Amino acid sequence: SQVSEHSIIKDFTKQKYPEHAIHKVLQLMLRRGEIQHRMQRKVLYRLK
Amino acid sequence: RIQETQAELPRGSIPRSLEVILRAEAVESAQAGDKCDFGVDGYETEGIRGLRALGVRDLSYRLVFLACCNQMTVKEWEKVFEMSQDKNLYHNLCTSLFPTIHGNDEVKRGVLLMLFGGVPKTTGEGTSLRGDINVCIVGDPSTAKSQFLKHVEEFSPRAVYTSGKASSAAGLTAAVVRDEESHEFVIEAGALMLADNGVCCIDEFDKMDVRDQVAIHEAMEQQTISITKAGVKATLNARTSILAAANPISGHYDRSKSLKQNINLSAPIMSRFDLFFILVDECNEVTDYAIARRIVDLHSRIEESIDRVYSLDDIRRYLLFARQFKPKISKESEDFIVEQYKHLRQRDGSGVTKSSWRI
Amino acid sequence: PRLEIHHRFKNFLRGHNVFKERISDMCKENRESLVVNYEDLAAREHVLAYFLPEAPAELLQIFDEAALEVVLAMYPKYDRITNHIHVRISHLPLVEELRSLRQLHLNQLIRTSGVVTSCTGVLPTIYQNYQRIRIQESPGKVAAGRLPRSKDAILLADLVDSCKPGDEIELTGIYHNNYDGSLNTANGFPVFATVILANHVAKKEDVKMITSLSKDQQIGEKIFASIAPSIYGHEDIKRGLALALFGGHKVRGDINVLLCGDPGTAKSQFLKYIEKVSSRAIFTTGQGASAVGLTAYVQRHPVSREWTLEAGALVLADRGVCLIDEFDKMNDQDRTSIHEAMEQQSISISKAGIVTSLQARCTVIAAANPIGGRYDPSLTFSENVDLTEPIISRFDILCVVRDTVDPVQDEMLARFVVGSHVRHHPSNQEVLKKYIIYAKERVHPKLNQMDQDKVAKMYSDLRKESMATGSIPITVRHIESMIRMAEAHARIHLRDYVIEDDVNMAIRVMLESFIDTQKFSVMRSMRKTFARPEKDLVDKARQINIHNLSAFYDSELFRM
């Protein structure tokens, strides 16, 4: 919580990490079948 | 989507959302969050296929209409003129508005004056002269919060029952409305503007840590909101006074410690505030014993009934229309305070007990 | 409606000396220009001239088809020139100067003006056909104070790479509301709900009466005794304002004017009065400014929308002046991006693989806001900063306030407020505004070759004096601003000398700077002044008074 998807990207920029990093990790850890990815699959299927 | 008037609505409201279409006449003419104050041949019969119901369920289920944009007065005024002959009228007038307050006469004194208004318009295309009053009151250490006095002000029209700030607050945080079918968040800053042409009472002022801190600064200084989300951009008018009370984080400790870093609030906002107030309790057993008695007195209605001679709100609104009438105040009375004001700025440095250096 | 002209003109698809040469003007060189006068259009075929304001729409289809007819017949080799012909009809009188901003007049040819701001070569199949550009129309003016409706134009792969910043061009066309978003899979246009197509981009008086008074010396004497009438401020501020008003190859420069007050007093709002004189002023207020606040940011976009090319007010004031308010209240994240751009006022890449340039040449005017109290803490100001060095060091001058309790000086301001409120209550000069502004465009003096050394000689002496008792404690960068500051002096009087009256005033600039950086013990060491290897090579140039490091055999540089 409080570390959701809409703010995690800005954290990398705060760490002087451009948008290049988010594809390499953030966009790739959810495709791994992470619980966070499965969390969106069930909770936010209709709630958004 | 016009919303029904809350004032006319009862306690249990369940507002009904109007769905009306407004033409160009509505463009830049309405403010977000304010009241609306302006024969066949060849035997072609039925039976041919091609009937579909997709075009019927959409519009028919909604609301489809079009719209297009004496002695009684004297009687109230008579009391003002006639009562002038009584000695010390001004003293009794101050008490008259606060029937349910015990102590804290200095606190209500600022609030009392806060009602009076007067905002000059722009005729020479110059700067906006500020005519509102923005006072913040320092009180309890946030336990049995003396902000409870705010509740008294609620019994008055043109006010907003602020739910502090820790709330969903869909207003004032407008968002894109067009996620290809619809969006829940709308372009609306009603969270504050709802008290336009009125007075706003904002509770829980200490909860402005991140989101409000940026927000209120823009609102306070500029009297407008510049919402911009790449699909909407416009400026509005939020003309109202701000009544707020602030409490410390965990108690009052700046009595012995300097205010530097100790109050731990946001300076650029509290700096813009006009006045501040301090609540010092005294061992006055005459009033300390009578604090609760005046409270319980409303339970003793069996043997005492208070007659209603005048409404404490109607009399106030008589002054509202007095503003269009011209005071034609001479300069002779005006500058006299200004001349004395020179003495005021020096005497602040006389070594009296300090509380907050503002100058 | 009518029949006589339609069929004849359609069969047309089945002073002229200039036209004879202009039809061949396009060649393999690809100058990419088409200039047609409107008066000639009425001259050749008069029947069309009356139909231009009625049915201009059909001309667009005809023009593209008609151009191929003449060219293909002559020389098929010319077919491979941009593979497109653009309609470039000139103006059609009428002329709306202020009433054109109406949505009631759709389906009509519209004459207007605009400026190309940026190009989208640096950015990465339905959406690929077009791109997105940020365009404004309303300029900075007192009457333009109410916020206007911003234009968003769409380039349909026709004017890409052919548009350069700084072209004061005129836009003409018809506003058809052919809203392509009927599929409801994108965003939408503001109030002026219409799709804006581009059709015109060029490729290659009271001024005189005032100018007569400009040269006059009778008004040239009282001009510097009326510069600051609103509050009369402080003598240093007027100097900064005067320099900002003029705003003065690689002959560039930046001005850092610093103020030391508090936001509650209108001193913080003193910069608001500049927009009355300035032509381009935008208030940022810090976070959440109007659209793009000169800082670039990235947001998460849906499946099919265009990434945003951030157009700052920096671009919109090319060779202009840009005003920034509440500079120190911006977010920490914005600082990182803006730190690099401010250094070069552009984006420069020299990898020889990817090259682009974005112009930003306004005079950066901003005011710093003290954090909390002025000097309440007892610790060092310079040595107790966790921030990064290069960002802080962008300020050329660090002015300190003089005097604290002066009721007499404060007395005047109060009466101004009281008198001001009197005028606004009911009771039953553009000549002076443009005098300073117009001057900065006309005065361009020349330099004397035998006197260039003497000008630079004087300041060089002052530097070496500070190196006797010390260890490189003075930087040339502070001087670097001082030399450009004296430049406006000659631009104003053109008297060939500097008076000793001005010399005393410029001295007060430097003494204030030493106060802030040095501990209050400056009252002991600097009494006499107050009371009365790449960088090393740069110092070497001052000894010979030659800026150009490639002045040896300059005859062969001209040959290249």
UniProtKB/Swiss-Prot annotation, chain A:
Compartments, as annotated in UniProt: Nucleus; Chromosome
N6-acetyllysine: residues carrying this PTM: K10
Subunit comment: Component of the MCM2-7 complex. The complex forms a toroidal hexameric ring with the proposed subunit order MCM2-MCM6-MCM4-MCM7-MCM3-MCM5. Component of the CMG helicase complex, a hexameric ring of related MCM2-7 subunits stabilized by CDC45 and the tetrameric GINS complex. Interacts with ANKRD17. Interacts with MCMBP. Interacts with TONSL; the interaction is direct.
Disorder association: Meier-Gorlin syndrome 8: A form of Meier-Gorlin syndrome, a syndrome characterized by bilateral microtia, aplasia/hypoplasia of the patellae, and severe intrauterine and postnatal growth retardation with short stature and poor weight gain. Additional clinical findings include anomalies of cranial sutures, microcephaly, apparently low-set and simple ears, microstomia, full lips, highly arched or cleft palate, micrognathia, genitourinary tract anomalies, and various skeletal anomalies.
Family named by the database record: Belongs to the MCM family.
Function in brief: Acts as a component of the MCM2-7 complex (MCM complex) which is the replicative helicase essential for 'once per cell cycle' DNA replication initiation and elongation in eukaryotic cells. Core component of CDC45-MCM-GINS (CMG) helicase, the molecular machine that unwinds template DNA during replication, and around which the replisome is built.
Miscellaneous comment as given in the Swiss-Prot or TrEMBL entry: Early fractionation of eukaryotic MCM proteins yielded a variety of dimeric, trimeric and tetrameric complexes with unclear biological significance. The MCM2-7 hexamer is the proposed physiological active complex.
Protein name: DNA replication licensing factor MCM5
Whole-protein residues included: 687 to 734 of 734
Curated annotation (Swiss-Prot), chain B:
Modifications the protein undergoes after translation, according to the UniProt entry: O-glycosylated (O-GlcNAcylated), in a cell cycle-dependent manner.
Residues where ATP binds: H102, S142, T143, A144, K145, S146, N247
Disulphide bridges, residue numbers: none
Residue positions, PTM Phosphothreonine: T45
MCM domain sequence ranges: 89-296
Motif, Arginine finger: chain positions: 271-274
Localization annotation: Nucleus; Chromosome
Domain of life: Eukaryota
Phosphoserine: residues bearing it: S13
Its biological purpose: Acts as a component of the MCM2-7 complex (MCM complex) which is the replicative helicase essential for 'once per cell cycle' DNA replication initiation and elongation in eukaryotic cells. Core component of CDC45-MCM-GINS (CMG) helicase, the molecular machine that unwinds template DNA during replication, and around which the replisome is built.
Family, as annotated: Belongs to the MCM family.
Miscellaneous information on this protein: Early fractionation of eukaryotic MCM proteins yielded a variety of dimeric, trimeric and tetrameric complexes with unclear biological significance. Specifically a MCM467 subcomplex is shown to have in vitro helicase activity which is inhibited by the MCM2 subunit. The MCM2-7 hexamer is the proposed physiological active complex.
Subunit structure: Component of the MCM2-7 complex. The complex forms a toroidal hexameric ring with the proposed subunit order MCM2-MCM6-MCM4-MCM7-MCM3-MCM5. Component of the CMG helicase complex, a hexameric ring of related MCM2-7 subunits stabilized by CDC45 and the tetrameric GINS complex. May interact with MCM10. Interacts with TIPIN. Interacts with CDT1. Interacts with MCMBP. Interacts with DDI2.
Protein name (Swiss-Prot/TrEMBL): DNA replication licensing factor MCM6
Residues of the full protein shown: 207 to 616 of 821
Curated annotation (Swiss-Prot), chain C:
Any GO molecular function: single-stranded DNA binding
GO terms under cellular component: chromatin; chromosome, telomeric region; cilium; CMG complex; cytoplasm; cytosol; intracellular membrane-bounded organelle; MCM complex
Annotated keywords: Acetylation, ATP-binding, Cell cycle, Chromosome, Deafness, Disease variant, DNA replication, DNA-binding, Helicase, Hydrolase, Isopeptide bond, Metal-binding, Non-syndromic deafness, Nucleotide-binding, Nucleus, Phosphoprotein, Ubl conjugation, Zinc, Zinc-finger
One GO term (biological process): cellular response to interleukin-4
Keyword Cell division: no
Domain MCM: 219-417
Position of sequence motif Arginine finger: 393-396
Enzyme Commission number(s): 3.6.4.12
Phosphoserine: residues bearing it: S138, S230
List of residues that carry N6-acetyllysine: K20
Subcellular location field: Nucleus; Chromosome
Main location: nucleus
Modification comment: Phosphorylation by the CDC7-DBF4 complex during G1/S phase is required for the initiation of DNA replication.
Residues reported to bind ADP: S268, Q269
Family: Belongs to the MCM family.
Misc: Early fractionation of eukaryotic MCM proteins yielded a variety of dimeric, trimeric and tetrameric complexes with unclear biological significance. Specifically a MCM467 subcomplex is shown to have in vitro helicase activity which is inhibited by the MCM2 subunit. The MCM2-7 hexamer is the proposed physiological active complex.
Quaternary structure (record): Component of the MCM2-7 complex. The complex forms a toroidal hexameric ring with the proposed subunit order MCM2-MCM6-MCM4-MCM7-MCM3-MCM5. Component of the CMG helicase complex, a hexameric ring of related MCM2-7 subunits stabilized by CDC45 and the tetrameric GINS complex. Interacts with DBF4. Interacts with KAT7. May interact with MCM10. Component of the replisome complex composed of at least DONSON, MCM2, MCM7, PCNA and TICRR. Forms a co-chaperone complex with DNAJC9 and histone H3.3-H4 heterodimers.
Protein name (database record): DNA replication licensing factor MCM2
Organism expressing this protein natively: Homo sapiens (Human)
Lineage: Eukaryota, Metazoa, Chordata, Craniata, Vertebrata
